[PDB]
Amino acid sequence: QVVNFGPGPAKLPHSVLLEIQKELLDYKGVGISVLEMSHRSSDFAKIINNTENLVRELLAVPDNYKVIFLQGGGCGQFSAVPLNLIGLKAGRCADYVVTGAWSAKAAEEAKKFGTINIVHPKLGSYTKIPDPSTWNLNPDASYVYYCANETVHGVEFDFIPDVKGAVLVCDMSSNFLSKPVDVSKFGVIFAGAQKNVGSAGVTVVIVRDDLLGFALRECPSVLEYKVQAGNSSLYNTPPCFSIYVMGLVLEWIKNNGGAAAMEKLSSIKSQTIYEIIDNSQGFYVCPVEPQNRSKMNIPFRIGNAKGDDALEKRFLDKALELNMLSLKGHRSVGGIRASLYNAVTIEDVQKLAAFMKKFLEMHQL
Amino acid sequence: QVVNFGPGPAKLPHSVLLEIQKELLDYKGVGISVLEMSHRSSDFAKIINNTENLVRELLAVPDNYKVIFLQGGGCGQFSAVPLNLIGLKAGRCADYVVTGAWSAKAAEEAKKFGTINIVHPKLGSYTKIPDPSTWNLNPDASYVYYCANETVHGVEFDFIPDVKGAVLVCDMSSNFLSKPVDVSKFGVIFAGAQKNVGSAGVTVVIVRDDLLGFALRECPSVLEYKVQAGNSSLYNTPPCFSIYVMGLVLEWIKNNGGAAAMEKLSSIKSQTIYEIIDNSQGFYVCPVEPQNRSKMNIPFRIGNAKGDDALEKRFLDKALELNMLSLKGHRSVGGIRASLYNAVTIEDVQKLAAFMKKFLEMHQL
Amino acid sequence: QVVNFGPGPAKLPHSVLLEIQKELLDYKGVGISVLEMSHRSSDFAKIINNTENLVRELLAVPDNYKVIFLQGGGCGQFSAVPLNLIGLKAGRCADYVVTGAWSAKAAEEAKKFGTINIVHPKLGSYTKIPDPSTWNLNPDASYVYYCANETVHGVEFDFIPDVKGAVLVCDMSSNFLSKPVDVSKFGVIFAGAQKNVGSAGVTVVIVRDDLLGFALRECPSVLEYKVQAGNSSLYNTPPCFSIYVMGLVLEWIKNNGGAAAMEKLSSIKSQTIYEIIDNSQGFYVCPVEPQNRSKMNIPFRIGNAKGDDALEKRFLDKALELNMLSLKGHRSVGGIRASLYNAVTIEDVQKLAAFMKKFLEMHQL
Amino acid sequence: QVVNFGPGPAKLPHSVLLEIQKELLDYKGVGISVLEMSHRSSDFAKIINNTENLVRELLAVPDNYKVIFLQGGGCGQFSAVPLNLIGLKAGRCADYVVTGAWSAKAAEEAKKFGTINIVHPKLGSYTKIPDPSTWNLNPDASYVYYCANETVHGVEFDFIPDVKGAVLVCDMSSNFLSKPVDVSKFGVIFAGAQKNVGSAGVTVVIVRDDLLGFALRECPSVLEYKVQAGNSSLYNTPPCFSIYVMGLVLEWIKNNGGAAAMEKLSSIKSQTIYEIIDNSQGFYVCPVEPQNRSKMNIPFRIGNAKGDDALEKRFLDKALELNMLSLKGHRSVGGIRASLYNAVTIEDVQKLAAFMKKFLEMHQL
Ligand SMILES: Cc1ncc(COP(=O)(O)O)c(/C=N/[C@@H](COP(=O)(O)O)C(=O)O)c1O
Ligand SMILES: Cc1ncc(COP(=O)(O)O)c(CN)c1O
């Protein structure tokens, strides 16, 4: 009974994988696979339209927003957001809120297309969100960028930051549809499906329809929002099977209570793991400030704040023999990371909860 | 009993889809799905390395070449080829060989990144290939581009042109691994997997190692050849499932005799359909000249050289009744188009051949 | 599911058996079975003429050759060839090239009508074709006989030998129409139709029209080439149903690309098996020198050169459990033998190759 | 609705053609066709042994008699009988009785293998049997040959002739198993299956076991009784499907009363037509003497003895409108010939009887 705590690609609901297996050779009586299905056929037109309607219903996406499915992953949008939006104002300036490895990597990628100004002082360690009241915002910047949830460091926004009245861009790859979102506050929301809403190969991008037509000339057509929105994400061959998988995962989300229930499940799973760390008497330490602790990714150290390597490997190896996968923290941080996306059930978190209390009972003073 | 003549995405071998189904929940005893498999796991490392080895083995790729798997499809490389290569020489110039709709679209996209020079007069109709002795090639061009197989107009190269020593870029989306290729004579080879080596979502790129480090600054990192070769295509989350699907089709290709056998089958499949056209007494009309006729995509008309709309609808309606799918010609050309890719079997073409004979016998005057 | 690797009689195309089944009671509306059809009727003249034209068309038989259909099988020609041709020169001598079991049988049978001389030294094993330079040819011999393909030992000519201008008689029974043939180089070609062109009961004999009229006095009139050629194979009641079946198989070969396509298909098929043997690391042994390996019959042993009986039985027992018939080698040789004639499809050879690979993976020490 | 009066190949029972059609693709559930079956398999062993058992049962063939199945038809035995038996005595003589065209052909063919003495003077008209007591028999002759039923002239033996202890050979091709036979009185019986007991392609031969081993050197192996009886008709590939068809016809004759009932059913059929001729008052002319009239073939003329070409054409034209096929007389006699073999039912003959009665009533002067 494997329990997959993958960081991305992640666990998919067992119910969904069972339907993908059944329909793999004959999708709902059409006589062919989705892997063989044409993106121009009427069969796939209903698949991609259903996926889009499930994005607009679950997130309550206003009618003045375009929902498109592109390739290239989240790292692809690190280039797509500037190429499409850095030309909103003549200065070609952009403000970036760096709270972890991904918002940092995004700001570096944005330097290829203009002058990038980070809005706050560089944090010594990614352990908190700089107070937005201290944000040095440029009134001539084309947009403001920030990552809602840092998968490696465990820093998550529990608010939508006030950014004057400027265009707001948000990376929700690791917390997409984990909680309801007031979409109207955002200019562009993008998320890789391989984390919380499907399989790797497709990236959902929600754009306000007044931001189309500002893309730079060097923006590749397959990544230009205006081109891709005008063709309903069918400018070229899209990731057909990936969109079909995401729709089934989206269907699973709607059946289990929508975005409102996902947030409640994400509270229970994160709290039970955090309360084991807060009561660990120092044995488990999470360097993130309590007001910004991510509910999707929980990276922690064992024993001491610097990380007892001998104790961590024993934790990983004994978790492996218990069929708990991908608990090893990121390479650039080490330590332990526990990913608690939507597919991760509460029974799966309890196995991790009982295993962490028992491992502390056997190693702590 | 469905016979899928899809043009892209296209038919997959039935033995492959059977394995994808029984392993979909537990890949080779790992305990999870490939859809859940992390791209940083030991398990996916075997899959992506096995796919590369098969690309190198089946095509006999020399050692001085990188094999990377990118996202964005074929049209993604229409932008990635200039972004990475057009700065190879100081002129930012490039030569393109337009033989059909796909090379034409490729030249239009490359204009976003430099000065493009189409090396020949505009063909009144894409029915032939201009002789390469008559090519107005620029000695200062960064590369010479051409599409090996035109999927819409059925025009194919049965030779590697003499570009007078220039770097040669080739689009082999619709004939990749349908015949042996001398990889040494090319600078860059790319192909969308959704046509002949698997499913959509992944694009195989074969690059000569001395052509990295010339990418423009606006080139997105996920599409930069140097960045992805220096990461073995794992710069960000790659299309794991599409790479795993492509790996099986490559295994299936090697089991049926490799690229040398695919050329033998493509000749039998294509000739059995061209024979029916050449001996049709004008009932079936293929406008492509014989020296350039594609062995992958055969477009033709019925009734006359311009196409009897009544006969072509009766043809496509009865073809659907016989469970023969995606025979309808491309929206910009109409008529009929039969796609005979690798997975399309001889018993598939024979069913089509018998239907074309019975239909001509019943409707010719 | 049944996969028929029969040596002869062999498998017939499933489309041929399906048509024979539906016309068995009312052949093309005439109201009777072919089994009831008179050999003097207008309907059967159209049948036997169409069968002769297809033989002339697919093999490109010159106009100065007679195409006659006889009874008695190939072993019947072992007597009809001497009876008709051994009196061509007054000496009544014939030179024979023994390359396997069926050449020796034919050479021994010919000793009942004249003095027979084997042109090459007795080979210790039927594993290689003696170099035509080694042949000790009699300039007074009436003809020179050789077997194109040895069905029991797997030794095949991929050339027409030089016989110093003598009349060349060939036994192509087990490779008839598996490849194009320069008929102008031969004097007499015969082939039992039960191996690669039809069912048992009829033999096709192609004789140059000037070799008629040299038959001995003891030649039965039903086997005399001059008598049957003058009666269009209708001197007596011919095997009507066998000739009807043979015509349908000829039509199936023509619809699948004629002799040229059969050579391409027979190359892919035999390569699939030989590649397993050549890379088996001594687990499969094929004694025939690779330059003389048959593309129709692949005899081999399992374990060692002499063959491990315990392993070969387990192979055949498991193969029979998988509905793969007639894999047992010939009685005089034993071991394994795979017959891959024209009707044996690529998927059929793919089931066998996948089985041999798994069997080698389960028992290789 | 078709009434098949064929002379050979002839009508087969509707019951037999049906089971052949049902089992054509999967004989008794073994997976393959009889056309694909190997003559060495245990499946064909049951077929040929049952066909041998039925012949021995329906004719009461003693144990000292061999039953073999050859190729070459009836005319094949015109040469195989002398080749096997003309050397019983050193003189190489053979006594032949020429009562019609088929015994005349056999006598001329036998001259190729020895000196042939016709036992009676030329008849002038094949209308009677020369008295066996006036037969000029050679006491040193190797055998005595005679045709029991002359298919062209309608002259049948209703007795076994006394040849004074000579080895007796009989050509029962056109009345085989139409009546019981005292096999003990014969040395060799043979019959082409295509006239009374199946379809063309196979010949049954019944030989006393002490008449083997007298074949000349020039006899082909496939036609030597000693060779073929020693291998149980499996010296080479036998007409597998033609032997299988014979087994069903014999099984049909057994289910309908054996030879004893066929003789009495043949009496009803022939008496119906012969009486119409006798009472025709010269409108229908049968020149054969009543004591020697055949019960299988009834040749006659219309109008007068020499034949009215006008009436004989309208008879064959109106018979063709009524679907009464093959009623035209043989090429060497012309006129009309009705063949009343076993599968020809009483209901069939009544259609002919009513037609002849109506034609006479409409054109008799
Ligand atoms: C009594 C008897 N003996 C031998 C034969 C020859 O049969 P085959 O040698 O298998 O053709 C035959 C064949 N008789 C047929 C022959 O027709 P054909 O003259 O061959 O068109 C008939 O009477 O019309 C036969 O009737
Ligand atoms: C939050 C977040 N943002 C961006 C990315 C970039 O990944 P990709 O572009 O390959 O989907 C990731 C992948 N770990 C991520 O977790």
Spacing, Cα D74 to ligand 1 middle (Å): 7
Query: Any known ligand binding at A345?
Result: no
Residue corresponding to tokens 């066709």: D33
User: Which of C224, C188, C194, C191 lies closest to C208, judged by CA?
Assistant: C188
Nearest chain D residue to C83, by CA: D218
Find the distance separating the first CA and the last CA of chain C, reported in whole Å: 32
Q: Residue C24: list chain D partners with CB under 8 A.
A: 17, 20-21, 24
Helix (H) or strand (E) holding B145: strand B144-147
CA atoms within 13 A on the CB side of A336: 33
d(CA D328, CA D336): 5
CA distance B263 to chain C (A): 10
Q: Which residues line ligand 2 (CB under 6 A)?
A: A 8, 73-76, 102, 151, 171, 173-174, 192, 194-195; B 236-237
Structure-block tokens of residue C284: 């499969």
Strand partners, A328: A336
Assign 3-class secondary structure to B224-284.
CHHHHHCCCCCCCCCCHHHHHHHHHHHHHHHHCCHHHHHHHHHHHHHHHHHHHHHCCCCCE
**Which residue has 């007596």 as its token pair?**
C236
- Contact at 8 Å (CB) between C73 and D222? yes
Give the C-alpha separation, C363 to C297, whole Å: 24
Q: What counts of helices (H) and strands (E) characterise chain D?
A: 9, 14
DSSP string, C224-254: -HHHHHHTTT-SS---HHHHHHHHHHHHHHH
Measure the CA–CA gap between A258 and A57, rounded to whole angstroms: 9
Give the Cα separation of D363 and D365 in Å (integer): 6
Q: Where are the beta strands (DSSP E) in D277-344?
A: 284-285, 297-302, 324-325, 336-339
User: Does residue D74's CB lie within 6 angstroms of at least one atom of ligand 1?
Assistant: yes
Beta pairing class for B144-147 and B93-97: parallel
Distance set, CA A114 to CA A80, A189, B107 (Å): 13, 20, 27
- In whole angstroms, give the CA distance from residue B145 to residue B188: 9
- φ, ψ for residue D223 (rounded to 5)? -120, 5
Cα–Cα dist A85/A223, whole Å = 12
User: Resolution limit in angstroms?
Assistant: 2.8
CA angle C250, C255, C257 (to 5 degrees): 95
Torsion of CA A207, A212, A214, A217, to 10 degrees: 100
DSSP-derived letter for residue B142 is S
Q: Name the minimum distance, in Å, from the CA of A282 to any CA of chain B.
A: 31
Q: How would you write B94-136 as a 3-class SS string?
A: EEEECCCHHHHHHHHHHCCCCEEEECCCCCCCCCCCCCHHHCC
What is the DSSP track for C139-165?
TT-S-EEEESEETTTTEE-SS----TT
Do C77 and C205 touch, CB atoms closer than 8 A? yes
CB B243 within 8 A of CB B51: yes
- The widest CA-to-CA distance across chain B, in whole angstroms, is 65
Is A14 known to sit in a ligand binding site? no
Exposed, middle or buried: residue C8 (CB in 10 Å: 0-12, 13-18, 19+)? buried
Mutate to test the interface with B, among C273, C340, C347 (most CBs of B within 10 A): C347
Burial class, A353, CB count within 10 angstroms (exposed 0-12 / middle 13-18 / buried 19+):
middle
> Is C257 within 8 Å of B265 when comparing Cβ atoms?
no
| Beta pairing class for D155-156 and D149-150 | antiparallel
Residue having the nearest C-alpha atom to atom 26 of ligand 1: D151
Element (DSSP H or E) covering residue A265: helix A258-278
Contact between residue C114 and residue C108 where contact means Cβ atoms under 8 Å apart: no
- Tokens for C336? 């394994």
Pairing of strands C188-192, C149-150: unpaired
Bridge partners, D338 (sequence order): D298
Nearest-angstrom CA–CA distance, B322 and A339: 50
Q: Tell me the C-alpha distance between C1 and C5, whole Å.
A: 13
The C-alpha torsion from D51 through D53 and D57 to D60, rounded to 10°, is 110
Q: How far apart are CA A355 and CA C44, in angstroms?
A: 85
Give the integer Cα–Cα distance in Å for A279 and A162. 34
Instruction: Decide: A119 and A136 in contact? Cβ < 8 Å.
Output: yes
Q: What angle do CA B50, B54, B58 make, to 5 degrees?
A: 175
Task: Name every residue whose Cβ is closer than 8 Å to that of residue A220 and which is 6 or more positions away in sequence.
Answer: A83, B72, B76, B78, B79, B80, B83, B109, B220, B223
Question: For atom 2 of ligand 1, which residue has the closest CA?
Answer: D173
Q: Do C268 and B255 touch (CB under 8 A)?
A: no
Under 8 Å CB-to-CB from A275, ≥6 apart: which residues?
none
Give CA–CA dist B157/C184, Å, rounded.
37
Which one-letter amino acid corresponds to residue D342? N
Question: Whole-angstrom Cα distance, residue C106 to residue C103?
Answer: 5
- For residue C255, give the amino acid letter: N
Instruction: Write out chain C residues lying below 8 Å of B265, CB-based.
Output: 264, 268
A154, B46, B62, B226, B250 from B229: Cα distances, Å: 30, 17, 15, 5, 21
Q: Residue C106: enclosing H or E segment and its boundaries?
A: helix C101-110
Euclidean distance between CA atoms C32 and D343, whole angstroms: 13
Counting every residue written for chain B, the total comes to 365
CB C85 within 8 A of CB C113: no
d(CA C338, CA C359): 15
Query: Judging by DSSP bridges, how do beta strands D188-192 and A93-97 pair with one another?
Result: unpaired
Shortest Cα distance, chain B CAs vs residue C240, angstroms: 27
User: Could you tell me the CA-to-CA distances from A32 to A45, B25, C301, D26, D212 in Å, in that order?
Assistant: 15, 20, 42, 30, 66
Q: Is C323 on the interface with B (CB under 8 A)?
A: no
According to the annotation, is D6 in a ligand binding site? no
Strands A188-192, A284-285: pairing kind: unpaired
Which residue type is seen at A343? A
Q: Are A33 and A24 in contact (CB under 8 A)?
A: yes
CA-wise closest residue to C252 among B46, B272, B246, B342: B272
For an interface test with B, the pick among C256, C263, C349 (most B C-beta atoms closer than 10 Å) comes out as: C256
Q: Which residue has the tokens 């057509």?
A: A221
Looking at residue C48, its amino acid is: I
Nearest to A38 among B40, B323, B326 (CB): B326
Number of alpha carbons in the 13 Å side-chain half-sphere of residue D200: 31
Please name the residue that has the structure tokens 């020039």. D218
Q: Is B69 helix (H, G, I), strand (E, B) or coil?
A: strand
For residue B197, the chain A residues in CB contact (below 8 A) are none
Residue B327 in contact with residue B340, Cβ under 8 Å? Answer: no
Q: If you measure from the C-alpha of residue C174 to the centroid of ligand 1, how many angstroms do you get, rounded to a whole number?
A: 32
- Scored b (16 or more CB within 10 A) or e, D13-40 reads beebbeebbebbbebeebbbbbbbbbbb
Say which residue the tokens 């090639």 belong to: B137
Window C:211-240, CB contacts with D under 8 Å: 216-223, 235-240
Contact A54, A250 (CB under 8 A): yes
Whether C185 and C164 have beta carbons less than 8 Å apart is answered as: no
The dihedrals phi and psi of C206, each to the nearest 5 degrees, come to -110, 115
Instruction: State whether B272 and C264 contact (CB < 8 Å).
Output: no
Q: SS3 for A234?
A: coil
Q: Beta-carbon neighbour count of residue C133 at 10 Å? A: 6
The count of CB pairs under 8 A between chains A and B is 203
Q: Strand D297-302 relative to strand D336-339: parallel, antiparallel, unpaired?
A: antiparallel
φ, ψ (nearest 5 deg) of residue C151: -65, -25
Chain B residues whose beta carbon lies within 8 Å of the beta carbon of residue C15:
350
CB B148 within 8 A of CB B171: yes
**Burial profile D260-287: b = 16 or more Cβ within 10 angstroms, e = fewer:** eebbebbeebbebbbebbeebeebbbbe
Indicate the residue of A8, A11, A24 with minimum beta-carbon distance to B237: A8
Number of Cβ atoms within 10 Å of the Cβ of D105: 19
Which residues in chain C are contacts of D240 at CB distance < 8 A? 9, 199-201
Question: Who contacts C289 (Cβ-Cβ below 8 Å, separation ≥6)?
Answer: C127, C128
**Rounded Cα distance, C350 and C327, in Å:** 15
- In chain D, the largest separation of any two C-alpha atoms, in whole Å, equals 65
Interchain CB contact of B254 with C (< 8 Å): no
Q: Is A120 exposed, middle or buried (0-12, 13-18, 19+ CB in 10 A)?
A: middle
| Dihedral class, residue A96 (left if φ above 0, else alpha if ψ from -120 to 50, else beta) | beta
C199: Cβ contacts below 8 Å, ≥ 6 apart: C9, C12, C193, C241, C242, C245, C246, D35, D240, D241
- Which of A174, A194, A196 most suits a substitution to test ligand 2, by most atoms within 8 Å of the C-beta? A174
Please, what are the domains in chain D?
3-9+257-362 (3.90.1150.10), 14-256 (3.40.640.10)
- For ligand 2, atom 7, the nearest C-alpha belongs to A74
Radius of gyration of the CA atoms of chain D, in A? 21
Kindly list the catalytic residues of B.
102, 171, 195
Give the position of tokens 């022939």: D270
Q: How many CA atoms lie within 13 A of C360 on its CB side?
A: 19
Which of B15, B256, B271 is facing C257, going by the closest CB pair? Answer: B271
- H or E element at residue D118: strand D115-118
Tokens of D93: 């003589």
Length of chain A: 365
Given C11, C89, C102, C348, the catalytic residue:
C102
For residue D172 the two structure tokens come to 């029962």
Angle at the Cα of A86 (from A83 to A91), degrees rounded to 5? 140
**Structural tokens at position A55:** 């994005």
**Euclidean distance between CA atoms C211 and C226, whole angstroms:** 8
Chains that touch D (3 or more CB pairs under 8 A): C
DSSP D158: S
Counting Cα atoms < 13 Å in the Cβ hemisphere of D207 gives: 29
Instruction: Return the H-helix or E-strand segment holding A142.
Output: strand A141-147
Sorted by sequence, the CB contacts under 8 Å of residue A291 that are 6+ apart come out as A128, A129, A158
Which residues of B are less than 8 Å from A10 in CB distance?
36
Q: How does strand A93-97 pair with strand A141-147? A: parallel
Residue of chain B whose alpha carbon sits nearest to that of A21: B21
Determine how β-strand B168-171 pairs with β-strand C203-208: unpaired
Peptide bond into C9 cis (omega under 30): yes
